[PDB]
Amino acid sequence: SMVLDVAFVLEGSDKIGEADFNRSKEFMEEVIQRMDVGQDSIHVTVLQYSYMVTVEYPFSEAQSKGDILQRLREIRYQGGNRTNTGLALRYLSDHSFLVSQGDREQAPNLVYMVTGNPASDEIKRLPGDIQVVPIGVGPNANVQELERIGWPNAPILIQDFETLPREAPDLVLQRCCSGEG
Numbered sequence: 661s662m663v664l665d666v667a668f669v670l671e672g673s674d675k676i677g678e679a680d681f682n683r684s685k686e687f688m689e690e691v692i693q694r695m696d697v698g699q700d701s702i703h704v705t706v707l708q709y710s711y712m713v714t715v716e717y718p719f720s721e722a723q724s725k726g727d728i729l730q731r732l733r734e735i736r737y738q739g740g741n742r743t744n745t746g747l748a749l750r751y752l753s754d755h756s757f758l759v760s761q762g763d764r765e766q767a768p769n770l771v772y773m774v775t776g777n778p779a780s781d782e783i784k785r786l787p788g789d790i791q792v793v794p795i796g797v798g799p800n801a802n803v804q805e806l807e808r809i810g811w812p813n814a815p816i817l818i819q820d821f822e823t824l825p826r827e828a829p830d831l832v833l834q835r836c837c838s839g840e841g
């Protein structure tokens with residue numbers, strides 16, 4: 661009944677580290693489990709980023725909850741020496757959300773992006789047909805950058821990675837899905 665194209669983007673840099681990445685992955689998996697994901701409803705794509713952007717699941721592969729969860733359970737922390745948030749945002753606009761890559765023109769493009777550090781590269785807000793909700797986590801997230809990305813809405817700010825998988829899934833569901841889930 662809910663027709664949305666949802667991207668999750670997780671920072672996996674050396675500064676995040678493996679344990680906090682695992683907490684971000686748990687956050688993502690909980691949300692996916694609770695969303696109405698499926699062939700004719702919510703579609704999911706997933707990026708992990710640091711220096712480079714890794715497509716962990718594209719819109720063009722099977723949009724079935726089981727297939728998505730299996731793959732996401734199998735993928736792992738990538739590490740890396742930058743937080744190239746701008747590169748990741750450009751990737752969403754230039755590739756992830758193209759109709760040629762499985763985007764549906766009529767389904768709103770929503771992004772939930774978890775970051776814990778200031779960007780290493782240049783940040784500009786994406787063209788507005790892409791709605792980005794940044795989730796800043798811990799004391800080194802740059803609030804002004806996240807406001808720029810997320811305008812007109814406030815970023816979701818989470819105190820630390822321990823708190824992320826316990827508080828953030830409800831917050832995302834409130835935004836995407838009227839709190840149903």
Ligand SMILES: *[C@@H]1O[C@H](CO)[C@@H](O)[C@H](O)[C@H]1NC(C)=O
Binds near residue numbers: 678679682
């Ligand atoms: C992260 O999760 C993976 C996959 O379950 C596990 O093998 C690994 O030990 C975890 N790492 C940390 C630091 O918790």
Ligand SMILES: *[C@@H]1O[C@H](CO)[C@@H](O)[C@H](O)[C@H]1NC(C)=O
Binds near residue numbers: 711740741
């Ligand atoms: C940082 O990561 C990049 C991309 O993998 C790599 O080319 C470069 O050597 C790394 N920098 C250092 C100082 O190791």
Ligand SMILES: [Ca+2]
Binds near residue numbers: 767
């Ligand atoms: Ca779309």
